Design an enzyme around this catalytic site. Structure first.
Site, PDB file in Angstrom:
ATOM      1  N   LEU A  69       0.909  -1.175   0.000  1.00 50.75           N
ATOM      2  CA  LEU A  69       0.000   0.000   0.000  1.00 50.75           C
ATOM      3  C   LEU A  69       0.951   1.228   0.000  1.00 50.75           C
ATOM      4  CD1 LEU A  69      -2.391  -1.696   0.390  1.00 50.75           C
ATOM      5  CD2 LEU A  69      -1.950  -1.465   2.880  1.00 50.75           C
ATOM      6  N   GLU A  74      -8.569   0.189   8.949  1.00 52.29           N
ATOM      7  CA  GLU A  74      -8.997   0.147   7.520  1.00 52.29           C
ATOM      8  C   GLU A  74      -8.997  -1.342   7.086  1.00 52.29           C
ATOM      9  OE1 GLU A  74     -10.326   0.772   3.852  1.00 52.29           O
ATOM     10  OE2 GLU A  74      -8.327  -0.122   3.991  1.00 52.29           O
TER      11      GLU A  74
HETATM   12  C1  LIG Z   1       0.185  -5.037   3.377  1.00 50.56           C
HETATM   13  O1  LIG Z   1      -0.600  -6.023   4.039  1.00 50.56           O
HETATM   14  C2  LIG Z   1      -1.862  -6.415   3.576  1.00 50.56           C
HETATM   15  C3  LIG Z   1      -2.296  -5.970   2.328  1.00 50.56           C
HETATM   16  C4  LIG Z   1      -3.517  -6.333   1.797  1.00 50.56           C
HETATM   17  N1  LIG Z   1      -3.864  -5.842   0.516  1.00 50.56           N
HETATM   18  C5  LIG Z   1      -2.816  -5.326  -0.385  1.00 50.56           C
HETATM   19  C6  LIG Z   1      -5.262  -5.816   0.069  1.00 50.56           C
HETATM   20  C7  LIG Z   1      -5.969  -4.455   0.401  1.00 50.56           C
HETATM   21  C8  LIG Z   1      -6.136  -4.175   1.914  1.00 50.56           C
HETATM   22  C9  LIG Z   1      -6.941  -2.883   2.301  1.00 50.56           C
HETATM   23  C10 LIG Z   1      -8.046  -2.601   1.361  1.00 50.56           C
HETATM   24  C11 LIG Z   1      -8.220  -3.248   0.128  1.00 50.56           C
HETATM   25  C12 LIG Z   1      -7.353  -4.473  -0.297  1.00 50.56           C
HETATM   26  C13 LIG Z   1      -9.347  -2.914  -0.645  1.00 50.56           C
HETATM   27  N2  LIG Z   1      -9.551  -3.465  -1.868  1.00 50.56           N
HETATM   28  N3  LIG Z   1     -10.248  -2.017  -0.208  1.00 50.56           N
HETATM   29  C14 LIG Z   1     -10.010  -1.413   1.008  1.00 50.56           C
HETATM   30  N4  LIG Z   1     -10.922  -0.577   1.567  1.00 50.56           N
HETATM   31  N5  LIG Z   1      -8.996  -1.700   1.833  1.00 50.56           N
HETATM   32  C15 LIG Z   1      -4.341  -7.192   2.539  1.00 50.56           C
HETATM   33  C16 LIG Z   1      -3.925  -7.639   3.787  1.00 50.56           C
HETATM   34  O2  LIG Z   1      -4.693  -8.484   4.560  1.00 50.56           O
HETATM   35  C17 LIG Z   1      -6.063  -8.742   4.160  1.00 50.56           C
HETATM   36  C18 LIG Z   1      -2.670  -7.255   4.276  1.00 50.56           C
HETATM   37  O3  LIG Z   1      -2.483  -7.826   5.508  1.00 50.56           O
HETATM   38  C19 LIG Z   1      -2.770  -7.003   6.641  1.00 50.56           C
END
Ligand SMILES: COc1cc(N(C)C[C@@H]2CCC3=C(C2)C(N)=N[C@@H](N)N3)cc(OC)c1OC
Length: 186
Positions: free
Chosen positions: A22, A30
Site C-alpha cells: 500500500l 482500515e
Molecule cells: C500489506 O498487508 C496487507 C495488504 C492487503 N492488501 C494489499 C489488500 C488491500 C487491503 C486494504 C483494502 C483493500 C485491499 C481494498 N480493496 N479495499 C479497502 N478498503 N482496503 C491485505 C492484507 O490483509 C487482508 C494485508 O495484511 C494485513
C-alpha cells in the site's frame, strides 16, 4: 444471488499501490473494515466471492492468503493455472461471473466483492448492471504506481448512508480517512 460490489482504499492522488504494498503505512481499522465488509454473510450456507487480479493477490502477504471465510478467485490472462491457495482462476470478469451459475459456484455464493487492482476495477465499472463502490478516501497524497480510475460523479451517485458504514472521519497514525458508498445501475 448476491450483488456486485467494488471495494477500494485510495489516496487523494487516486493511488492504491506502490511496489507491491500500500502507498501508506498500515491502517489497522482500515484493514478491519475491509475484512469485515468482504467476509460478512448472514445467509446460512453461502460465502462471499472475492475477485482479484494477479497484482492484488501477490500484494497480499502469504500469511493472509487465501482470505479466510471467502471464496478466492484470481482474474488473469497470463497465469496458466490457479496460484497456490486460490480456489479459481478466470481469464475475465465475464467468465468469473459466468462461473457463479455453474453447479459449484451457484448454491455457494452470496455477495461478489471486487478487491483490485486497477484493470479489474475498470472492467467492473463498465459492466452492465447495478454496481456499488465502497470507497475509503485517505485524505493525503502518497507516491503510487497503481491507481483507481476517476468516478464519473455524474454517473455514480453517493449514498448518504449505508448500513454498517461509519459516517464520521476516522484517524489513525495521523492520517484522516472516511468511508463512502457509491452506486449505479445500468
Ligand atoms: C500489506 O498487508 C496487507 C495488504 C492487503 N492488501 C494489499 C489488500 C488491500 C487491503 C486494504 C483494502 C483493500 C485491499 C481494498 N480493496 N479495499 C479497502 N478498503 N482496503 C491485505 C492484507 O490483509 C487482508 C494485508 O495484511 C494485513
Amino acid at each position: 444471488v448476491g450483488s456486485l460490489n467494488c471495494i477500494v482504499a485510495v489516496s487523494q492522488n487516486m493511488g492504491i499501490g506502490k511496489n507491491g504494498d500500500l502507498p501508506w503505512p498500515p491502517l489497522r481499522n482500515e484493514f478491519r473494515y475491509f475484512q469485515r465488509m468482504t467476509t460478512t454473510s448472514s445467509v446460512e450456507g453461502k460465502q462471499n466471492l472475492v475477485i482479484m487480479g494477479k497484482k492484488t493477490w501477490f500484494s497480499i502477504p502469504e500469511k493472509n492468503r487465501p482470505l479466510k471465510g471467502r471464496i478466492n478467485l484470481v482474474l488473469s490472462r497470463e497465469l496458466k493455472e490457479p496460484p497456490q491457495g486460490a480456489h479459481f482462476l478466470s481469464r475475465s470478469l465475464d467468465d468469473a461471473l459466468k462461473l457463479t451459475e455453474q453447479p459449484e459456484l451457484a448454491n455457494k455464493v452470496d455477495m461478489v466483492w471486487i478487491v483490485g487492482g486497477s484493470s479489474v476495477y475498470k472492467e467492473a465499472m463498465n459492466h452492465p448492471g447495478h454496481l456499488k463502490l465502497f470507497v475509503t478516501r485517505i485524505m493525503q497524497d502518497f507516491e503510487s504506481d497503481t491507481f483507481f480510475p476517476e468516478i464519473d460523479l455524474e454517473k455514480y451517485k453517493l449514498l448518504p448512508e449505508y448500513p454498517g458504514v461509519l459516517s464520521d472521519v476516522q484517524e489513525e497514525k495521523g492520517i484522516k480517512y472516511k468511508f463512502e458508498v457509491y452506486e449505479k445501475n445500468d
